[PDB]
Coordinates of C-alpha atoms and ligand atoms in Angstrom, one line a residue:
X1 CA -28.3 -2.0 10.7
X2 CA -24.9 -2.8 12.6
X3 CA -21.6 -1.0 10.9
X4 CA -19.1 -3.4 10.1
X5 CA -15.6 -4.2 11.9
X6 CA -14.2 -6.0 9.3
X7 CA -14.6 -5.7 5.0
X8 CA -13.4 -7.4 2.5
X9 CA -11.4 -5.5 -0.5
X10 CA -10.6 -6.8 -4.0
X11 CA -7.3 -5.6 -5.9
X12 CA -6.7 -6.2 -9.2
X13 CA -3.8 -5.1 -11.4
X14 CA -3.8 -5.6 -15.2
X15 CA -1.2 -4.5 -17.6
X16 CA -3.8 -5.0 -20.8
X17 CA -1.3 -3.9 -23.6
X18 CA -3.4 -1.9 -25.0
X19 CA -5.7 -4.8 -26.5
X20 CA -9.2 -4.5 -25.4
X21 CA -10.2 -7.2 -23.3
X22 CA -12.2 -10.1 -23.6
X23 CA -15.6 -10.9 -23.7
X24 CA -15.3 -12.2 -20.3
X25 CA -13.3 -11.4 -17.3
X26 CA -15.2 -12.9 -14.3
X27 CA -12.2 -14.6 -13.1
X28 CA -10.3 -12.2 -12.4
X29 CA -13.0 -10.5 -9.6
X30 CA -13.7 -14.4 -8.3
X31 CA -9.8 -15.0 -7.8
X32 CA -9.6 -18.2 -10.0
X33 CA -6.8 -19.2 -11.7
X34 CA -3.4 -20.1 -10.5
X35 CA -1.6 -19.2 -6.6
X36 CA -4.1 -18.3 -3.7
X37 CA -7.5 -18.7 -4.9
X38 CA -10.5 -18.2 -3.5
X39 CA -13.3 -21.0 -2.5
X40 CA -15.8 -21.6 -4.7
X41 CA -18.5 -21.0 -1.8
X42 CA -17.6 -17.4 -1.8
X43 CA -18.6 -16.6 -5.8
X44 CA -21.3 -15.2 -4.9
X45 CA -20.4 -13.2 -1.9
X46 CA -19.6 -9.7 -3.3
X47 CA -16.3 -7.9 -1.6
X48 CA -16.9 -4.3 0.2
X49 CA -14.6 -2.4 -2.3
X50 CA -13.2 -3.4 -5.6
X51 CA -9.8 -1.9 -6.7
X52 CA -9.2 -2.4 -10.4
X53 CA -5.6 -0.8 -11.3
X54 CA -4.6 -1.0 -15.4
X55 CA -1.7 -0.3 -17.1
X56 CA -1.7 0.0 -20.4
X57 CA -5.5 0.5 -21.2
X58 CA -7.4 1.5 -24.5
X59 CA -10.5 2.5 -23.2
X60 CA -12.2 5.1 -22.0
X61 CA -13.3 5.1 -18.3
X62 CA -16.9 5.0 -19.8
X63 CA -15.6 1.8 -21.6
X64 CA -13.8 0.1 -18.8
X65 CA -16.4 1.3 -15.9
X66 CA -19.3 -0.7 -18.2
X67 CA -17.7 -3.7 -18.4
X68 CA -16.1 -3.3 -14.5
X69 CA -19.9 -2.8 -13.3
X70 CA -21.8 -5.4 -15.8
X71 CA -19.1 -8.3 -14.7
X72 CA -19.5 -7.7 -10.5
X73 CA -23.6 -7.3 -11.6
X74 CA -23.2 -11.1 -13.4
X75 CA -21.2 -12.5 -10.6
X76 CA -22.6 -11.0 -7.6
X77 CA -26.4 -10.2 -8.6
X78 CA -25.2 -5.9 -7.3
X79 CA -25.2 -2.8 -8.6
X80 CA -22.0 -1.4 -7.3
X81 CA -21.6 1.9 -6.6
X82 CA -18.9 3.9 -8.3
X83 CA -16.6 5.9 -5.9
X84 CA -13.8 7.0 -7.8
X85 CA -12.2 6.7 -11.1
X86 CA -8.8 8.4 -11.7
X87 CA -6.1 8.0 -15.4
X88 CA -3.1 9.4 -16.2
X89 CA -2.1 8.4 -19.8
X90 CA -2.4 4.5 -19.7
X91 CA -2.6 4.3 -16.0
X92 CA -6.2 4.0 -14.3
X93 CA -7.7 3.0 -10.9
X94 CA -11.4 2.7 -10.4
X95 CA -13.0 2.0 -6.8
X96 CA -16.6 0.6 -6.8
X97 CA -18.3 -0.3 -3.1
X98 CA -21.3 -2.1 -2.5
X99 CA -24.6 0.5 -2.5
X100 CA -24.7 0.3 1.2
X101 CA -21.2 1.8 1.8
X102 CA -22.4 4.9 0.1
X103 CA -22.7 7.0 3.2
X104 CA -19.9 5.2 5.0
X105 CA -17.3 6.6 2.2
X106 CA -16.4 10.1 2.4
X107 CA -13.3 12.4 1.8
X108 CA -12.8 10.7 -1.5
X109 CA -9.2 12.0 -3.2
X110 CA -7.5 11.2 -6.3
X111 CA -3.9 12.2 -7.6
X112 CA -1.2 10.9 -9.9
X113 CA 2.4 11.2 -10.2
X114 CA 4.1 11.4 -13.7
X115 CA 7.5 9.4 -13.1
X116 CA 11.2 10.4 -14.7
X117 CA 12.4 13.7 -17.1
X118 CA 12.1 14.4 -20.5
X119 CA 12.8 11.0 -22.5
X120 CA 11.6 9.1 -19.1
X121 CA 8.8 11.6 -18.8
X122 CA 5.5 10.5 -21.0
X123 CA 4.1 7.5 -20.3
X124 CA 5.2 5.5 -16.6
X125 CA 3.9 7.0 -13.3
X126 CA 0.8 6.2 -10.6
X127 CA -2.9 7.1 -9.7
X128 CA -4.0 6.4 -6.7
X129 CA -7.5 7.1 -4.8
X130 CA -8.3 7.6 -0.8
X131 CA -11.4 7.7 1.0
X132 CA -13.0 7.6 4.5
X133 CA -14.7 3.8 5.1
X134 CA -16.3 4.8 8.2
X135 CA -13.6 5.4 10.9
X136 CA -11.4 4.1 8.7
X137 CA -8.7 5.7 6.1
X138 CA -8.0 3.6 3.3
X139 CA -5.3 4.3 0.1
X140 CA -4.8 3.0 -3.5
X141 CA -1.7 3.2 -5.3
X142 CA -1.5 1.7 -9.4
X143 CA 1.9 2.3 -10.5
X144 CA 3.0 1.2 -13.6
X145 CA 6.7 1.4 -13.2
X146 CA 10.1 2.1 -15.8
X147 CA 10.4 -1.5 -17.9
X148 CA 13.4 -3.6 -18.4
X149 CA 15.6 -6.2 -16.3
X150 CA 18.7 -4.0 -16.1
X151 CA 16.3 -0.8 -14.5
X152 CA 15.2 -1.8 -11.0
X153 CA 17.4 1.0 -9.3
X154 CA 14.8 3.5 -11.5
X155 CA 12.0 1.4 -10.7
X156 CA 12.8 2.4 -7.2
X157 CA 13.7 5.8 -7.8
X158 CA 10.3 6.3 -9.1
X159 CA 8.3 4.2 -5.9
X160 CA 10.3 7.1 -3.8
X161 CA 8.9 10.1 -6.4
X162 CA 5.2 8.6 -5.9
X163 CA 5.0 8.1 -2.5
X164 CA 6.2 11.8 -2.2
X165 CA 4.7 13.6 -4.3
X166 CA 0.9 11.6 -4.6
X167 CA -1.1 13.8 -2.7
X168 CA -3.9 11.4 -1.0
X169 CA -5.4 11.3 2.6
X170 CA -5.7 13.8 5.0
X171 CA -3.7 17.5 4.3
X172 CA -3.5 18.9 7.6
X173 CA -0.7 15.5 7.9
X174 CA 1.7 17.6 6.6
X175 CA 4.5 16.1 7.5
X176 CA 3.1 12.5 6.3
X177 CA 3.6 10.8 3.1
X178 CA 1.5 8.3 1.9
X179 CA 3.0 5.4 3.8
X180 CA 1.5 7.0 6.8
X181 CA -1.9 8.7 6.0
X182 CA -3.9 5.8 5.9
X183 CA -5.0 2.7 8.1
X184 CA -4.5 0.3 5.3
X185 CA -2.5 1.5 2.3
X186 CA -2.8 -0.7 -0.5
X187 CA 0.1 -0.3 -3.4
X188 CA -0.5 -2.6 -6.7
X189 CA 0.6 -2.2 -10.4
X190 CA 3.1 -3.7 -13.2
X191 CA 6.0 -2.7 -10.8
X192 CA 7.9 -4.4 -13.7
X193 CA 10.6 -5.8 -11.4
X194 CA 12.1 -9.0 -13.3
X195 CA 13.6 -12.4 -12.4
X196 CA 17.4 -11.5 -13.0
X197 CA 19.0 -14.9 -14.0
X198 CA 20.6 -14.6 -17.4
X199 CA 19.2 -14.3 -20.6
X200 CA 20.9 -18.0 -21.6
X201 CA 18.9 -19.7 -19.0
X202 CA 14.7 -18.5 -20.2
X203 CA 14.0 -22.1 -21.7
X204 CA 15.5 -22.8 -17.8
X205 CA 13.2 -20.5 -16.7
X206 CA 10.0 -21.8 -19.1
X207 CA 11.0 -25.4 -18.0
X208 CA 10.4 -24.4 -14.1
X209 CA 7.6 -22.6 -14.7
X210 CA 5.9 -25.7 -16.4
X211 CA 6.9 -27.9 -13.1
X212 CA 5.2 -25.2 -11.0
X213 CA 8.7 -24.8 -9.5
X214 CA 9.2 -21.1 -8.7
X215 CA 11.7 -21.0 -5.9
X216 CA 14.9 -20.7 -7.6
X217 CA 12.9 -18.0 -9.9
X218 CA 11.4 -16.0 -6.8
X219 CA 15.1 -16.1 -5.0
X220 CA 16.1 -13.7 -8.2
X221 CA 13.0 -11.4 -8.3
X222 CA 14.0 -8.2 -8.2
X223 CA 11.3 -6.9 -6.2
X224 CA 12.0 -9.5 -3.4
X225 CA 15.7 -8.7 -3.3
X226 CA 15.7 -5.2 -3.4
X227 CA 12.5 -5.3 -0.7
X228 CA 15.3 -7.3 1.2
X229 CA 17.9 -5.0 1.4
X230 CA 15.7 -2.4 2.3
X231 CA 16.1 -0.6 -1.6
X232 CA 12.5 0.0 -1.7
X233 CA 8.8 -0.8 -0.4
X234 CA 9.9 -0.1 3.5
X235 CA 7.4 -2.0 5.9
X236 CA 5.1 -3.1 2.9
X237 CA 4.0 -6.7 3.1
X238 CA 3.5 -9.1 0.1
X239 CA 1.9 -12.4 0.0
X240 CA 3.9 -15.4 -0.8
X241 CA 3.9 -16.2 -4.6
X242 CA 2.5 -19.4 -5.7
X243 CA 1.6 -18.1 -9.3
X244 CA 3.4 -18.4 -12.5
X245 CA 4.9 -15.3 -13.7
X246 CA 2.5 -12.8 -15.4
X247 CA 5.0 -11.4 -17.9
X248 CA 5.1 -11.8 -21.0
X249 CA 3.1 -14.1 -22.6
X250 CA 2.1 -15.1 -26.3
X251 CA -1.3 -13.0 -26.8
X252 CA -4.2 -15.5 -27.3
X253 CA -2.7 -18.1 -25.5
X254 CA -1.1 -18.6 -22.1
X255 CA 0.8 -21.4 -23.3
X256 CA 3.8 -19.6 -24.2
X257 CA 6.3 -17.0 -22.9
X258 CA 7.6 -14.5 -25.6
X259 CA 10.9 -13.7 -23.9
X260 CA 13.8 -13.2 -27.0
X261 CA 14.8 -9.7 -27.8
X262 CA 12.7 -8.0 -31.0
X263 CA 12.7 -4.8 -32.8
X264 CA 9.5 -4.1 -30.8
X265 CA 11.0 -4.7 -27.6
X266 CA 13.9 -2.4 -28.5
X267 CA 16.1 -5.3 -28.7
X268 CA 15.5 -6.3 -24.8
X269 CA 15.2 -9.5 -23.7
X270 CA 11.4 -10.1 -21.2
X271 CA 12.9 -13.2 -19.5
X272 CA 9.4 -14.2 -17.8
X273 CA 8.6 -12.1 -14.8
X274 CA 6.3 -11.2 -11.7
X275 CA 5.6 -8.0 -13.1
X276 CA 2.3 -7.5 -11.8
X277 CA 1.9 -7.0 -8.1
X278 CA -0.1 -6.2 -4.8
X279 CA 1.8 -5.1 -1.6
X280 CA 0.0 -3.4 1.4
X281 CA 1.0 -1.6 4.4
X282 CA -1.6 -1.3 7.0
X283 CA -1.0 0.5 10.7
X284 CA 0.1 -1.6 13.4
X285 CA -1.6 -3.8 15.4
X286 CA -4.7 -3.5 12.3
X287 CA -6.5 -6.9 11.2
X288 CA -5.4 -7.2 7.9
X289 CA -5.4 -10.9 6.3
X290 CA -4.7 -11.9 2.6
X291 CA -7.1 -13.9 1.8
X292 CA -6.1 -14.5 -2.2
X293 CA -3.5 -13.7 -4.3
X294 CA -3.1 -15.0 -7.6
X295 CA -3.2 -14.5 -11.3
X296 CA -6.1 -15.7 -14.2
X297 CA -5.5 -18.1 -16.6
X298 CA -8.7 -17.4 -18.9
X299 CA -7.9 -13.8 -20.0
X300 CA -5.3 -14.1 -22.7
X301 CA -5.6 -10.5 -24.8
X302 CA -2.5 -9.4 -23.1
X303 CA 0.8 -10.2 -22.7
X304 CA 0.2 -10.4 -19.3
X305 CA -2.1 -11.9 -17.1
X306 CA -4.6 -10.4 -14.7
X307 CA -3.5 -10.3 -10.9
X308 CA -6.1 -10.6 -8.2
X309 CA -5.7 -10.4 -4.1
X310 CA -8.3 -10.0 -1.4
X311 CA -8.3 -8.9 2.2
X312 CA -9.8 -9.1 5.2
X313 CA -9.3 -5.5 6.7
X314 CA -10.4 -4.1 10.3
X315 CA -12.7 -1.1 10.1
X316 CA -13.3 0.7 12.6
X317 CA -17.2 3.0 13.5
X318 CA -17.4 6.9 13.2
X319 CA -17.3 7.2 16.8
X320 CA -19.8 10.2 19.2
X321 CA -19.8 10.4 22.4
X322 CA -21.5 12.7 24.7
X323 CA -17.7 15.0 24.8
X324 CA -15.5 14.4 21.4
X325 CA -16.3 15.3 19.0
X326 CA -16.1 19.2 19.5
X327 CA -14.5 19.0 22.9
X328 CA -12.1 16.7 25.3
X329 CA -12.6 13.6 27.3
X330 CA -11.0 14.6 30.4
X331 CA -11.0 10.9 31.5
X332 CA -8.7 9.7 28.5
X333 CA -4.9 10.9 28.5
X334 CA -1.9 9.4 26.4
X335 CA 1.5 9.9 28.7
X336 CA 5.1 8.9 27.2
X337 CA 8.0 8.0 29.5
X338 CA 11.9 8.0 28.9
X339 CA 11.0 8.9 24.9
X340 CA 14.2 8.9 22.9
X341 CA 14.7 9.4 19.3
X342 CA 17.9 7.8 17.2
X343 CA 18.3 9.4 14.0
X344 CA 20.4 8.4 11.5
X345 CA 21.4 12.0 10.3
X346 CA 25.0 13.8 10.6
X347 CA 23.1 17.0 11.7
X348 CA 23.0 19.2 14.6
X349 CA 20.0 21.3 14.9
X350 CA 17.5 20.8 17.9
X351 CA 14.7 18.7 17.7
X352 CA 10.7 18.4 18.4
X353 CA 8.0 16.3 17.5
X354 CA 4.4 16.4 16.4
X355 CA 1.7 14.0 17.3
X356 CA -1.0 13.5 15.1
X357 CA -3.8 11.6 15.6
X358 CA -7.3 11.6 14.4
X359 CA -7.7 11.0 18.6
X360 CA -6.4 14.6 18.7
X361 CA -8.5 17.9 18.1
X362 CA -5.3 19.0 16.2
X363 CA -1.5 18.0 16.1
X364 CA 0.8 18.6 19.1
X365 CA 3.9 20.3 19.2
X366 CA 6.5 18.9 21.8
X367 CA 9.5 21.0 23.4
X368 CA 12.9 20.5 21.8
X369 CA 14.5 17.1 22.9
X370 CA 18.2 17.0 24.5
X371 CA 20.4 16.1 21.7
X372 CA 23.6 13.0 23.2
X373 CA 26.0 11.3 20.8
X374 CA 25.2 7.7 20.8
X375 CA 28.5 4.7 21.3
X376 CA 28.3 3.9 18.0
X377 CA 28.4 7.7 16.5
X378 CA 24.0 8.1 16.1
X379 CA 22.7 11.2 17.4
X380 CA 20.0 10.0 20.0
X381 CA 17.2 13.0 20.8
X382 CA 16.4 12.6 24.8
X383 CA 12.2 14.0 25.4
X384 CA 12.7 12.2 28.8
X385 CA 9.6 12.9 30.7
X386 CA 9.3 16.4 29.0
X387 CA 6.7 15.1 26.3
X388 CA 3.6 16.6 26.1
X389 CA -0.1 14.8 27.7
X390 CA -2.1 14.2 24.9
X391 CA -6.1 15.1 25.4
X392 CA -7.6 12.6 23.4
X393 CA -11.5 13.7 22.2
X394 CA -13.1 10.4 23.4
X395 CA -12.0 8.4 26.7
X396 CA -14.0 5.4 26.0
X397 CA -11.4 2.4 26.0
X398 CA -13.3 0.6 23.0
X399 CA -12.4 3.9 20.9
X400 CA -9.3 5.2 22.1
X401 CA -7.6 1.7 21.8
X402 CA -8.2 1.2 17.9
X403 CA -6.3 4.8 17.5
X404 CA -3.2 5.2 16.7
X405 CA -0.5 8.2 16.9
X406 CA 1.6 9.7 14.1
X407 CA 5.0 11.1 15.2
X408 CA 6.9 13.2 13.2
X409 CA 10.9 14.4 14.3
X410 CA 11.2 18.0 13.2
X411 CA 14.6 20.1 13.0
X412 CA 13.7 23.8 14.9
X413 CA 16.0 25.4 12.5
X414 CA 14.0 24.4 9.2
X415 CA 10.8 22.9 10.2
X416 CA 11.3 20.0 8.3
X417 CA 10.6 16.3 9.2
X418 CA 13.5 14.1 9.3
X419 CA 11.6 10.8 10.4
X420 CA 7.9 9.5 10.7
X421 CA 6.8 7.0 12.7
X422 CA 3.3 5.5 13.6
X423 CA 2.1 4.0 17.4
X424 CA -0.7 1.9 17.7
X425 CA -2.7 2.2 21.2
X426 CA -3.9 -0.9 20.6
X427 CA -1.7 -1.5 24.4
X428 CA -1.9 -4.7 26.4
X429 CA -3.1 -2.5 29.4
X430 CA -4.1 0.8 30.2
X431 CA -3.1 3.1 33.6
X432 CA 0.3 0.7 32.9
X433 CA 3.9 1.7 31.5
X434 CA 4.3 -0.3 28.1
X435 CA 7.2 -0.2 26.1
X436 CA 6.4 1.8 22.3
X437 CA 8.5 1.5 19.5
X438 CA 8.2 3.0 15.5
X439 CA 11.1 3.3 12.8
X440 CA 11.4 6.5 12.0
X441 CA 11.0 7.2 7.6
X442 CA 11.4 9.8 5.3
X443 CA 10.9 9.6 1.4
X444 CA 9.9 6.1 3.0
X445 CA 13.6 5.5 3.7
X446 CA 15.1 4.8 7.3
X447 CA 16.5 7.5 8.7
X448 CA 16.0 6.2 12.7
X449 CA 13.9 4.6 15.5
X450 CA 11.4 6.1 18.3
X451 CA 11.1 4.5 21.4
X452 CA 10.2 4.9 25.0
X453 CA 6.7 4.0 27.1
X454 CA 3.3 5.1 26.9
X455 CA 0.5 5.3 29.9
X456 CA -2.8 5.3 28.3
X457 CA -5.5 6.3 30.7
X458 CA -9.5 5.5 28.7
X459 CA -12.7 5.8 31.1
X460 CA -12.3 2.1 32.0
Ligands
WNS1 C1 -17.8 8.7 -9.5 C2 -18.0 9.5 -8.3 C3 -19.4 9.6 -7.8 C4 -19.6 9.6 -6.3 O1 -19.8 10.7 -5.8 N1 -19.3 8.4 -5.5 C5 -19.4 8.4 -4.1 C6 -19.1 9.5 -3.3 C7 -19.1 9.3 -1.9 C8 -19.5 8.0 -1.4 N2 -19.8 7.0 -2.2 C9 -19.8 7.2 -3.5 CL1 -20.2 5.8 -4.5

């Protein structure tokens, strides 16, 4: 029985405003409805791993899990496993996998971040859930972000408080947020970003929606434009939207959008929206293909609607050989050549890295770099040829070159990072001098670049 190199993953996202849901809710898992929908030849073909992220749910996980598992059983004819299940108020995630992926998922981990202080503190935050798939390290994020057109500078300020403070993935990469622990890091919720046009203009807004005409809607979506000058969601990805917004609909219906201002509202305005969203960031050089993205049109108990989207994602085997794990493979080696760092900071301390890699028996600590001032003002951190040679556990080529490497740029004076990066090995040759290259993050902001050349040696 083969492991796989590739799986398929369903996300969904509902905000279910606090209604229960309907009697039926197979859509949402078969990607029907409106945007990038799935082919009707694939009903029956159950996904790997199911990701179902609420906002806003009444149930109990008992509840929700019963309906979750009795839906995939009607569509697909299997029992799904249930992997993980994670709330905070409102806010749930549950992961379900196909029986046979029950010993290929380990290291499963669940945490949530409450979002805001005191009035902003009780009800927005995340969940999220990580796991082992094989060689593989997957993450989940459902946020359910702070509402209202005229908040997107909170709704980013709380992205950056969950991606530092969820606590997913592996520990010992310390210096790692979330944006970096996992090969595929999926990030979903009602990010309730809005399509800032003004309030005079929603029959406009209804009108375009009605022609299927969403470009002059998406070219004012908040999450787009902030994602475009770099205010949020760093390096994620988001398939293009070709679905009508989600937010906020007439109950019962989907024929109407309830966007004028009511006591219930607090006297705000809900012009209609993309609330409801699925962005991923996967390492580089990973196979990871959208394959759906969408919204129902048959589940009408909430002011929103339902969001589906499906990957394609490159898995990778737990890899033995007859050396790593529990030794070396003296005939694999990772080299770098003429490394430099550029960091954005206005800070002089000396510099190191660490390395981490799964590749690794345990992170590596580099010498301190020689700090230059750059022509236009940067401070550029010179390893030269000074960098350590990594000892990789495993030499052979069909391994080593589906790793990748973690750097972290550390001050010596405090310990703490000031940028992450990630490097694929996934090289064009081996025993050869190839150019790498990372932005360097922290609190998923830039703060500066890596680059240099690598010489990966494998037993090949
Ligand atoms: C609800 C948690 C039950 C559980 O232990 N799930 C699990 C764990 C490891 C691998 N696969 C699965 Cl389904």
């Amino acid at each position: 029985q083969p492991e796989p190199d590739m799986i398929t993953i369903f996300i969904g996202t509902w905000n279910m405003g606090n209604a229960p849901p309907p009697k039926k809710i197979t859509s949402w898992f078969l990607s029907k409805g409106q945007g990038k929908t799935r082919d009707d030849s694939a009903d029956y073909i159950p996904h790997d791993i199911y990701v179902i992220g609420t906002q806003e749910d009444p149930l109990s996980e008992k509840e929700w899990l019963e309906i979750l598992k009795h839906s995939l059983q009607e569509i697909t004819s299997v029992t799904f496993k249930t992997v993980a299940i994670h709330t905070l108020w409102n806010i749930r995630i549950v992961v379900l996998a196909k029986p046979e992926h029950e010993n290929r998922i380990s290291h499963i981990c669940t945490d949530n971040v409450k979002t805001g202080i005191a009035n902003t503190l009780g009800n927005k935050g995340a969940v999220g859930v990580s796991f082992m798939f094989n060689g593989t390290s997957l993450g989940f994020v459902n946020s359910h972000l702070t509402s209202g057109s005229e908040k997107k500078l909170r709704r980013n300020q709380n992205y950056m408080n969950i991606l530092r403070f969820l606590a997913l993935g592996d520990k010992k990469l310390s210096p790692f947020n979330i944006t970096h622990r996992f090969t595929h890091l999926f990030w979903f919720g009602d990010l309730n970003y809005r399509v800032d046009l003004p309030t005079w203009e929603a029959e406009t807004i209804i009108q375009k929606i009605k022609q299927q005409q969403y470009a002059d809607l998406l070219s004012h979506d908040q999450l787009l434009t902030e994602r475009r000058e770099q205010k949020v969601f760093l390096h994620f990805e988001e398939e293009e939207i070709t679905f009508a917004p989600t937010y906020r609909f007439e109950r019962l219906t989907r024929d109407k959008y309830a966007y004028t201002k009511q006591k219930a509202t607090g006297m705000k305005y809900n012009l209609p929206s993309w609330c409801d969203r699925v962005l991923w960031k996967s390492y580089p050089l990973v196979h990871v293909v959208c394959q759906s993205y969408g919204s129902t049109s048959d589940i009408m108990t909430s002011d929103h609607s339902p969001v589906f989207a499906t990957f394609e994602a490159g898995v990778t085997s737990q890899f033995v050989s007859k050396n790593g794990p529990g030794t070396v493979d003296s005939q694999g080696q990772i080299e770098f050549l003429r490394c430099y760092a550029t960091l954005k900071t206005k800070s002089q301390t000396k510099f190191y890295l660490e390395f981490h890699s799964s590749c690794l028996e345990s992170f590596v600590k580099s010498q301190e770099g020689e700090n230059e001032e750059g022509s236009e003002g940067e401070l550029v951190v010179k390893f030269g040829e000074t960098l350590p040679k990594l000892k990789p556990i495993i030499s052979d080529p069909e391994y080593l070159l589906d790793q990748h490497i973690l750097i972290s740029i550390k001050s010596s004076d405090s310990d703490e990072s000031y940028g992450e990066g990630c490097i694929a090995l996934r090289l064009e040759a081996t025993e050869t001098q190839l150019p790498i290259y990372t932005p360097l993050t922290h609190h998923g902001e830039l703060t500066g670049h890596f680059q240099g050349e690598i010489k990966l040696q494998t037993s090949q």
